[PDB]
Design a protein around this ligand. Structure first.
Ligand SMILES: O=C(Nc1ccccc1Cl)c1cnn2ccccc12
Ligand SMILES: O=C(Nc1ccccc1Cl)c1cnn2ccccc12
Lengths: 257, 251
C-alpha cells in the first residue's frame, strides 16, 4: 500500500545483508535510487510503519508483493550508516562537532517520536541510523553492544542511545579489546561499560562533562535510573544553541564530494 | 490510516500564509518538540519531493498538519532580490529537476493526481533548499483550462522560464484578463537575451523544453520523463559540493 512491481526496480546492486538483503535499485518510472530489502502478515507490520511519518524516520516508499519475491521499499540514503561515518576514518578523517551533536539531537528526536505513537524502536544501533544527502538522520527500524543487560541476563532505547553517544564522541569501537560477544554480555551483566578516560574521550570534546553524565546515566544497570528521551532533548537543546546554523552546513561541506 | 493530532498539542500558533486553500500557520508540537505547519488520498503519496503530511486535526478544526518549510516558497527565492541577490545555476537546475521528479511521481500514482494547479507559491523550500511540492495566479494556467492531462507541463514550462530569468512572466501586462487574452492568442513570456541571458548553462536545451512545454497544442507538449531525461545530463555537469556552496551563499 502502494505496491511496487519488482520489475520496476532496475540495476539491483547490493548494499547490506539475517533480517533480509538490502539492495540499491533505480526506479524505472520514478527515476530515483531506492533501497529494497528482501523478506522471508509482514504486510500488517509494514502498514504500522507507513503511519509513522516524521523527519528523522526512514520513509517506506512502498511494498513488493510478488509471489516469488516479497520486500520493503524505502528511500536510498546516499551517505550510508552512522557506523560508516564514525569508523571509515580513511573516507572521513574529520567529523565536526556541530554535525556530531546534530546527529545526537536528531536520533533523540526520532526515537522520542516513535515512543509517543499510538501504539508506540525495536533494537537501535549505529548500523540502523542512516544519513541522508545532507547528513540528516533517518532511523531504519522494525550486535549486542547496544543491548541492555536485562534483555539477555521499555527503557531499552535509552541504553542503546548512551552507547551511540559514547561511540559518536569517541569514534572508538565500544568493546575494541573484546573479541567474543559472550564476553561482552558477561562484563556488561557485571556492570562493565565502554571506558571513560582521556584516551577514549579527549579533553577537546565540547561539553565533555555534560555529555559524560548523559552517557553514564543512559547506560545505567538499573533501567529506572536511566533518563527519558525528553530529558536528553532537554539536555542537548542548550548545547545545540551553542552553534550557528551556518556551521552545520560548513561541517557537512567538509565531508561532501 | 493517517494520524490524528490534537489541536492542543500545537503550541505558539503564529500565521505563516493565506493561501487559496485555507490559512497556513506554524506551531510547535508539544510531544514531538518540532515546528509544524497547520492549514484550516494525499497520505498515500510519500515521496522525497512532495510535502509530507504529518497528520490531521479533527477537534470540532478539520486541519492538515505538514512539516514546517523554513525557507518558504520558490516565488520568494526568485523574486526577493534584496534577500537573494544571487541564486547559483546548480541550485536553480536542482530545483527544476526536483519539481519534475515530484510531478512525475504524482503522475505515476494509482490513481494519478493529475488534478493539480502547480505554481511557484506551492513549491516550498526545505532547510537545505530541497524542493517539497505542496499542491493541496493565471500565469501558470494553460489556455485550454480558461473555460471549464498535459496541464502540469504547461505550468512547469512557465516556472522554468521564471527560474532561469528571475523575471515576472508578464511584467508589462497589468490586467490578468489581458494575460488570458494574449495567451489564448498564442503569446507567451518573451525569449530573448534580456529575459534569458547567454550565460545560462544549457540555454538552447532549456529554451526548447520551455517552448515545447508551453505549446498551445497539449499534444505537442512533452512528458515529465522527457524533462528528466533532458535535465539528468545537465545536473551531472556539476559537483555535489557546488549545490551546498550555492545554498551556503544564500547566507
Ligand atoms: O536500509 C535501508 N533501507 C531499509 C531499511 C529497513 C528496511 C528496508 C529497507 Cl529498504 C537503506 C536505505 N538506504 N541505505 C543506504 C545504505 C544502507 C542501507 C540503506
Ligand atoms: O503550506 C504548508 N503546509 C501545508 C501545505 C498544504 C496543506 C497543509 C499544510 Cl500545513 C507550509 C509548511 N511550511 N510552510 C512554510 C511557508 C508557507 C507554507 C508552509
Amino acid at each position: 500500500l502502494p505496491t511496487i512491481p519488482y520489475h520496476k526496480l532496475a540495476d539491483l546492486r547490493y548494499l547490506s545483508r539475517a533480517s533480509g538483503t538490502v539492495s540499491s535499485a533505480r526506479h524505472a518510472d520514478w527515476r530515483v535510487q531506492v533501497a529494497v530489502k528482501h523478506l522471508h502478515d509482514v504486510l500488517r507490520e509494514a502498514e504500522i510503519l507507513h503511519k509513522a511519518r516524521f523527519s528523522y524516520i526512514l520513509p517506506i516508499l512502498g511494498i513488493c508483493n510478488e509471489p516469488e519475491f516479497l520486500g520493503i521499499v524505502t528511500e536510498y540514503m546516499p551517505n550510508g550508516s552512522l557506523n560508516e561515518l564514525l569508523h571509515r576514518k580513511t573516507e572521513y578523517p574529520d567529523v565536526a562537532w556541530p554535525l556530531r551533536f546534530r546527529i545526537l539531537h536528531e536520533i533523540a528526536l526520532g526515537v522520542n517520536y516513535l515512543h509517543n505513537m499510538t501504539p508506540p524502536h525495536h533494537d537501535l544501533k549505529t548500523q540502523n541510523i542512516l544519513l541522508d544527502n545532507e547528513f540528516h538522520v533517518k532511523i531504519a527500524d522494525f550486535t549486542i553492544i547496544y543491548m541492555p543487560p536485562e534483555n539477555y541476563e521499555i527503557k531499552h532505547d535509552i541504553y542503546s542511545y548512551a552507547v551511540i553517544t559514547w561511540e559518536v564522541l569517541s569514534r572508538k569501537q565500544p568493546f575494541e579489546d573484546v573479541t567474543n560477544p559472550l564476553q561482552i554480555m558477561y562484563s556488561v551483566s557485571q556492570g562493565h561499560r565502554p571506558v571513560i578516560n582521556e584516551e577514549s574521550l579527549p579533553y577537546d570534546i565540547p561539553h565533555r562533562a555534560r555529555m559524560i553524565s548523559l552517557i553514564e546515566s543512559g547506560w545505567a544497570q538499573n533501567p529506572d535510573e536511566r533518563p527519558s528521551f525528553l530529558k536528553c532533548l532537554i539536555e542537548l537543546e542548550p548545547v545545540l544553541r551553542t552553534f550557528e546554523e551556518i556551521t552545520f552546513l560548513e561541517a557537512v561541506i567538509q565531508l561532501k564530494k
